From a paper:
The Rpd3 small (Rpd3S) complex recognizes histone H3 trimethylation on lysine 36 (H3K36me3) and deacetylates histones H3 and H4 at multiple sites across transcribed regions.
Two engagement modes (‘close’ and ‘loose’) of the Rpd3S–nucleosome complexes were acquired in global density maps of 4.0 and 4.0 Å, respectively. Focused refinement led to significantly improved local maps, with 2.8 Å for the CHD–H3K36me3 nucleosome, 3.3 Å for the Rpd3S complex of the close state, and 3.4 Å for the Rpd3S complex of the loose state. Structural alignment revealed rotational displacement of the Rpd3S catalytic core from the close to the loose states, in which the MID domain of Rco1-A within the right arm leaves the linker DNA next to SHL +7 in the loose state. Upon engagement mode switch from the close to loose states, the H3K36me3 readout and SHL +2.5 DNA contacts act as anchoring sites to allow rotational displacement of Rpd3S, and the linker DNA contacts are temporally disrupted during the process, reflecting enzyme–substrate engagement dynamics. The existence of two engagement modes suggests dynamic association between the Rpd3S enzyme and its nucleosomal substrate, which may be beneficial for enzymatic turnover towards different acetylation sites occurred to histones H3 and H4 tails.
Residue numbers in the entry:
A (entry chain C): 220 to 401
B (entry chain B): 17 to 384
C (entry chain D): 96 to 130, 166 to 187, 259 to 378, 400 to 477, 489 to 523, 534 to 564
D (entry chain E): 545 to 564
E (entry chain A): 664 to 727, 749 to 840, 859 to 885, 890 to 962, 972 to 1032, 1134 to 1322
The structure:
DNA sequence: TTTAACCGCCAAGGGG
DNA sequence: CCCCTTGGCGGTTAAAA
């Protein structure tokens, strides 16, 4: 099924791929704008402008389902090989406190954006109907337009060398060795 | 000058072999010892045996995990170590042999003891050829090295002196010793190396240092087959300006045999006298020094060069004839004390060196 | 004490090929022939110095990344997984020590009664229809799939005809890459390589090879450069592709604030556009000299000259008034 | 190339007037 | 002036694709994007070759931390690594933020090593075998010493002994015997002594073998250019290379009369080359019986006419110009090459001979046991017999074919210390010189050109039409495509100047 | 598509 | 003893992939 991602978000995704795989950089976690925060802001800002009741409950259902699906599939199909060691570090750090792992409160705005790129390849191997998939595609498109609206604050260009709060952090020889060699 | 010269040599630094075809053998050090003992230089130097270092002194620069790994790793228990091997780069390039920890401890202890003797004032020249592993960086073996005993040396020298100058003339860039002092303005590093697609990979011209140690790191990139009349011409002005303007208190000099002509891995065309001119010019300043010995993978050359250097340090010019050491057969057809250059073509044009000097001097004009 | 006699398996092999106890190896004999006291004074003249100031202290590739390395293989399904390429990431030190089955095998054993599977999914759906149900199918099914490394979905990449996947899956772009007198000859025009900086080729001579200079011929605009004219130590053969100082930065840090040039898109999706003011029109660095966000301005070259002048005038008016 | 000449003549006269 | 800078830049860069980049950079600056410093740097790399326009740009614009390219920066999280001995000053001077890790600085590609010939590889293998023998023997010796100190005590530095006992008892019974020793010392001591004896015997024999192998390879190993030489001279001493060199010099000078220049300080080198040429001509079975004398007379006349050295002593052993075609130019270049090589050889000859005659030997064991008696039995060791003359005699021998090239090269290497590798092709270069003289003789047009040169040279008192009519006559003898070379020589100082007038006579 | 046969060019030496 | 006989090597090119 055809999905129309804006060109800026495609550029951002390509930049993420290049940063992670070529320059060996990984994400700075926990992100200061996480998946939960962006989804909640989207829901709060759109719901106050739409008055119809059904299209307002369906938005909340879509947001909750997106949160659950992100949580259930991040540790499966959203991380490169290099980023799995940091994922293991986070998992074991959480495992020391008998706590659960909530990626929506750690990752943000760039693993959700990369989450909605395989949806055409995720829906295809299912048993759903047609008019239900169309609604999902439409909702993802509205969410993408809203994300493109606030793109000058979720993806800003800052270098790891010059800023500690930058969206990406450099890795070390030991971490990269264990990741890409073990 | 007429300096009081100490000399450190452990009688066990030669009994620790790497892999079979591995180009790094410390046997050369023991060979050099014979060249120093049969030449009658024992009557002019105070030979000591530095006490081997312990974990609490290696961990001054290195980390607890790395040092703890080194002290337990063994060829016997290697297959039970699968994470630290790939993490710490202790695999094939830096192999694990039978006496790794003892060799590293001897190398560290020699450098630290020489630095201490310089500190108290017993000697004003320290020579420890076992140490000089200028590659290891705080968490990983790199280029045949496992413990950066040099950095321990500068730490001990800093415990007394306001400033230290570390000159490196090994063909490979001193990444390990430049990294540990990339930020501070106390230690000033100056490395002459081959820049290209060569092993260190680092050492670009514009690596003046970051943060508080800006303009306190000098890199001299050189091409294939440099010779004495060129290496001296590039060496002398830079060190002259450094010691006139930076004004160090002590000085460490890394005398590696990798720059010698016909070395197994190097690509320079320095003769024995071309190498010795650097040590002459460094000693020509009067400040206390701790000469170490790094690379060099042709023993018949590095042993001769190190013996000639230790003779020159004692203000004597040694005989060009060999005194019939134990390892006579190693020393070639004529059995002299000399390293002969090859006819390889020198690719270092004067214009490139002139530009390098202009950049380096312009950088240093703000280091009173 | 009566230990076993000797080591009959004494000499096995050495570096010389021979067992180190036999000697010449006569074949090598014929191959490699033609036809002030001693050190023992070191034991006593060594004084132990310890005055330190610190003295007192199945498949050969992972089924997730398609790469080789450490493998935790399975038995029910002939597949292989990295210890890290696994959900959850498991540590090689604490091996499960037991039958390890992939998620697909776990489902096929625990669930896959070929007909009853519908019932199972049905049950999940009917405990999620009242709640979020658009994602119910995906939420149920992704518990039956194996972990994978995340690759772009084969169509985001194709939006840019300047990127390509490397060997294992890496990023790759348009910058990935004794006496030789022939390097100064084009071989297509019979002319020399007049360097931009010095305007000379400096071939030297065969009789005097110490007057020639190495030349570069930049890999983007094909202009020749001496290695000495632009300070540089050696040729670029292995790493990235060399680019001479006659190119635009494509990345700018102004004091901070970053500027970057956009990427290359397929010409069908490229929206070219031309302005009308022709004097003052704030554009980015995306110009051409002669989804609607990547518009490259056609800058009308005579404008650039104008776009220069008054700016300098303005830069004067700041410091002259 | 004449518009540039006239515009810059006018602007230089204006700048001289502002810097008399 | 200031309203014409863009035209000047357009004519200076002289390219359209690079002018596009220049305009892009100017726009980048114009949009507040680029700063003033990087703009100045780019205009320095574009127009900085001129000392006039770039300065105008500089004063018109009113121009009047910096990280390196090889160090990354880790976040503060990777600062907290436990160092159980790091003191306060160590925290103060050390650095845990910036790391290089060459693999990052190598662009993940790899490293290019240095090239080593097979002789160096043979030396490395010999060194490896020597090291293995010495290491095992020394380990056994140290363990033997310790065991002796133990046994003499019991009659009434932690891994050496274990390793050596494991090596000796390789049947995997060593682990038990080590602890049995810790709780049997004399028997393992005597077994170690026996093993040491056999190892030392084998090492003596292998020392013999290694000495024999090394004595024929060491000097070859230090010969880097000499091994490739005599193959590169084949493809680098043609006519096309010389024309390429002279044209390159002309082209370089045409962006700013005497393109080439040579100086002939010595005289007897001419006689040396003549002796070599006559020896080769006498030996060679490739010409006619009168042709040999014809070639000899041609060479003698050319030498005694161009340089006016002597018309008779050659058999006892006002600036002049010369217009030439390719044949005469290549012949003169061959002559200049031979003269240059022999002058380089003869310049250092006094110090070379002084070094050879003072070559002392070591008497501790060298003269007692082992000597290199291969280059001395054939007299190719320059004992006395001043090195330049011996080199000439050996060159004549090799030209006559009674000396294989191997021993000539070996003697030259051992006498001149790889400083005379460029004499490996004396025979072939003399053969090429003779062939070029023959081709110069057997060409009608070339013969006419040399006839004109002879007339002009012997005239020695010409008119104001000297150059023009001579050039016109030679060009009439020549075609309308081949190049022209003006070779001049002044008897005052023996200096030869070459100008490359390819087609400038028209 | 490239890379080894393949004929010229050279020089050392084993042995019949 | 002298000639195959070996041993290598470089530009062309046609042949196996
Ligand atoms: Zn080195
Ligand atoms: Zn994997
Ligand atoms: Zn399975
Ligand atoms: Zn140039
Ligand atoms: Zn370019």
């Amino acid at each position: 099924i055809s999905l129309q991602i804006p060109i800026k978000l495609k550029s951002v995704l390509v930049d993420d791929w290049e940063y992670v795989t070529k320059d060996k950089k990984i994400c700075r976690l926990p992100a200061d704008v996480t998946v939960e925060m962006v989804l909640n802001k989207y829901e709060h800002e759109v719901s106050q402008e739409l008055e119809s009741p059904g299209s307002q409950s369906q938005l909340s259902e879509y947001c909750a389902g997106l949160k659950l699906y992100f949580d259930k599939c991040l540790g499966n199909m959203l991380l490169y090989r290099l980023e799995r060691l940091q994922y293991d570090e986070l998992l074991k750090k959480s495992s020391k406190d008998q706590k659960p792992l909530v990626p929506i409160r750690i990752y943000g705005a760039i693993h959700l954006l990369r989450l909605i790129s395989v949806l055409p390849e995720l829906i295809s191997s299912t048993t759903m109907d047609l008019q239900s998939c169309q609604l999902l595609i439409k909702q993802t498109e509205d969410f993408l337009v809203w994300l493109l609206m606030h793109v000058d604050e979720y993806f800003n260009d800052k270098d790891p060398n010059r800023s500690d709060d930058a969206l990406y952090v450099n890795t070390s020889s030991q971490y990269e060795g264990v990741a890409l060699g073990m | 000058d007429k300096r009081r010269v100490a000399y450190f040599y452990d009688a066990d630094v030669g009994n620790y072999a790497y892999g079979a075809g591995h180009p790094m053998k410390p046997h050369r050090i023991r060979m050099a010892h014979s060249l120093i003992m049969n030449y009658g230089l024992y009557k002019k130097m105070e030979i000591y045996r530095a006490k081997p270092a312990t974990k609490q002194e290696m961990c001054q620069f290195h980390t607890d995990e790395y040092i703890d790994f080194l002290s337990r790793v063994t060829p016997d228990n290697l297959e039970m170590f699968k994470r630290e091997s790939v993490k710490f780069n202790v695999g094939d390039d830096c192999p694990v042999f039978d006496g790794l920890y003892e060799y590293c401890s001897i190398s560290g202890g020699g450098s630290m003891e020489g630095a201490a003797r310089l500190n108290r004032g017993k000697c004003d020249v320290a020579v420890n050829y076992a140490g000089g592993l200028h590659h290891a960086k705080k968490s990983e073996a790199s280029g045949f090295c496992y413990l950066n005993d040099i950095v321990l040396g500068i730490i001990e020298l800093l415990r007394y002196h306001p400033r230290v100058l570390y000159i490196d003339i090994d063909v490979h860039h001193g990444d390990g010793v430049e990294e540990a002092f990339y930020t501070t303005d106390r230690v000033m590093t100056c490395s002459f190396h081959k820049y290209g697609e060569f092993f260190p990979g680092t050492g670009e011209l514009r690596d003046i240092g970051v943060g508080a140690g800006k303009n306190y790191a000098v890199n001299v990139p050189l091409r294939d087959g440099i010779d004495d009349a060129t290496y001296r011409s590039v060496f002398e002005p830079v060190i002259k300006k450094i010691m006139e303007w930076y004004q160090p208190s002590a000085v460490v000099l890394q005398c590696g045999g990798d720059s010698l002509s016909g070395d197994r891995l190097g690509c320079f065309n320095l003769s024995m006298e071309g190498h010795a001119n650097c040590v002459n010019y460094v000693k020509s300043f009067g400040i206390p020094m701790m000469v170490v010995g790094g690379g060099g993978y042709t023993m018949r050359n590095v042993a001769r060069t190190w013996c000639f250097e230790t003779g020159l340090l004692n203000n004597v010019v040694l005989d060009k004839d060999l005194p019939y050491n134990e390892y006579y057969e190693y020393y070639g057809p004529d059995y002299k004390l000399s390293v002969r250059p090859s006819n390889m073509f020198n690719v270092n044009t004067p214009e490139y060196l002139d530009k390098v000097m202009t950049n380096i001097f312009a950088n240093l004009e703000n280091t009173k | 004490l009566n230990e076993p006699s000797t080591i009959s398996e004494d000499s096995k092999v050495s570096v010389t090929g021979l067992p180190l106890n036999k000697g010449p190896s006569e074949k090598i004999k014929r191959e490699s022939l033609w036809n002030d006291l001693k050190t023992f004074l070191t034991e006593n003249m060594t004084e132990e110095s310890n005055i330190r100031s610190t003295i007192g202290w199945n498949e050969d590739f992972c089924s997730a990344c398609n790469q080789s390395g450490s493998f935790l293989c399975c038995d029910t399904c002939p597949k292989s997984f990295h210890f890290l390429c696994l959900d959850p990431p498991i540590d090689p030190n604490n091996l499960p020590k037991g039958d390890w089955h992939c998620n697909e095998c776990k489902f096929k054993i625990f669930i896959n009664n070929s007909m009853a599977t519908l019932k199972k999914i049905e049950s999940n759906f009917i405990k999620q229809n009242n709640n979020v149900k658009i994602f119910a199918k995906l939420l149920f099914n992704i518990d039956s799939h194996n972990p994978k490394q995340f690759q772009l979905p084969n169509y985001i990449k194709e939006t840019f005809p300047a990127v390509k996947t490397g060997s294992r899956g890496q990023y790759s772009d348009e910058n990935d890459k004794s006496y030789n007198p022939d390097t100064h000859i084009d071989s297509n025009s019979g002319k020399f390589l007049i360097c931009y900086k010095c305007n000379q080729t400096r071939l030297g001579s065969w009789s005097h090879p110490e007057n020639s200079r190495l030349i570069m011929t930049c890999d983007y605009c094909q202009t020749p450069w001496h290695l000495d004219c632009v300070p540089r130590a050696s040729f670029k053969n292995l790493g990235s592709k060399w680019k001479c100082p006659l190119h635009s930065p494509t990345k700018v840090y102004k004091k901070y604030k970053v500027w970057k040039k956009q990427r290359l898109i397929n010409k069908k999706n490229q929206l070219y556009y031309e302005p009308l003011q022709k004097i003052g029109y704030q554009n980015n660095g995306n110009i051409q000299i002669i989804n609607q966000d990547f518009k490259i301005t056609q800058i009308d070259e005579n404008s650039i000259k104008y776009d220069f002048f008054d700016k300098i005038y303005k830069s004067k008016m700041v410091q002259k008034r | 190339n004449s518009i540039k000449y006239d515009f810059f003549d006018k602007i230089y006269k204006s700048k001289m007037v502002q810097k008399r | 002036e200031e309203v014409t800078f863009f035209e000047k830049a357009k004519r200076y860069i002289g390219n359209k694709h690079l002018y596009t980049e220049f305009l892009k950079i100017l726009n980048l600056y114009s949009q507040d994007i680029l700063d003033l410093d990087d703009l100045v740097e780019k205009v320095d790399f574009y127009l900085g070759s001129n000392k006039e326009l770039f300065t105008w740009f500089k004063n018109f614009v009113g121009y009047q931390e910096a990280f390196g390219p090889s160090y990354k920066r880790l976040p503060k999280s990777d600062t907290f690594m436990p160092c159980s001995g790091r003191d306060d000053m160590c925290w103060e001077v050390l650095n845990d933020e910036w790391v290089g890790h060459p693999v990052w600085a190598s662009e993940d590609s790899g490293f290019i090593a240095h090239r080593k010939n097979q002789y160096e590889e043979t030396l490395f293998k010999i060194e490896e075998e020597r090291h293995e023998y010495d290491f095992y023997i020394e380990s056994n010796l140290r363990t033997i010493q310790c065991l002796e100190t133990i046994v003499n005590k019991i009659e009434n530095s932690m891994t050496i002994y274990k390793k050596v006992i494991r090596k000796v008892y390789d049947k995997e019974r060593g682990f038990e015997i080590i602890d049995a020793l810790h709780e049997t010392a004399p028997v393992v001591l005597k077994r170690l002594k026996q093993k040491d004896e056999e190892w030392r015997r084998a090492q003596r024999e292998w020392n013999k073998v290694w000495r024999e192998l090394e004595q024929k390879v060491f000097f070859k190993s230090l010969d880097h250019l000499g091994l490739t030489f005599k193959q590169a001279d084949k493809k680098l001493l043609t006519t096309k290379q010389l024309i390429s060199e002279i044209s390159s010099i002309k082209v370089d000078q045409t962006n700013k009369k005497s393109q080439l220049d040579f100086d002939f300080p010595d005289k007897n080198i001419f006689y040396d080359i003549l002796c070599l040429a006559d020896t080769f001509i006498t030996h060679t079975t490739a010409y006619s019986n009168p042709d040999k004398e014809r070639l000899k007379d041609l060479l003698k006349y050319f030498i005694s006419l161009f340089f006016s050295i002597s018309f008779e002593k050659i058999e006892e052993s006002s600036i002049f110009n010369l217009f030439a075609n390719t044949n005469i130019y290549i012949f003169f270049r061959h002559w200049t090459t031979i003269y240059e090589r022999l002058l380089e050889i003869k310049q250092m000859n006094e110090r070379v001979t002084k070094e050879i005659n003072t070559r002392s030997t070591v008497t501790f064991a060298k003269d007692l046991d082992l000597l290199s008696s291969q280059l001395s039995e054939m007299g190719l060791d320059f004992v006395g017999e001043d090195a330049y003359k011996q080199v000439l005699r050996l060159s004549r021998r090799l030209i006559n074919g009674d000396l294989e090239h191997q021993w000539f090269e070996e003697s030259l290497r051992q006498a001149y210390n790889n400083k005379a590798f460029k004499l490996y092709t004396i025979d072939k270069v003399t053969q090429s010189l003779v062939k070029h003289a023959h081709t110069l003789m057997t060409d009608a047009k070339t013969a006419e050109i040399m006839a004109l040169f002879v007339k002009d040279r012997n005239a020695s008192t010409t008119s104001a039409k000297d150059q023009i009519i001579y050039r016109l006559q030679v060009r009439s003898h020549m075609s309308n495509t081949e190049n022209m070379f003006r070779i001049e020589f002044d008897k005052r100082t023996l200096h030869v100047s070459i100008q490359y007038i390819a087609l400038d006579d028209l």
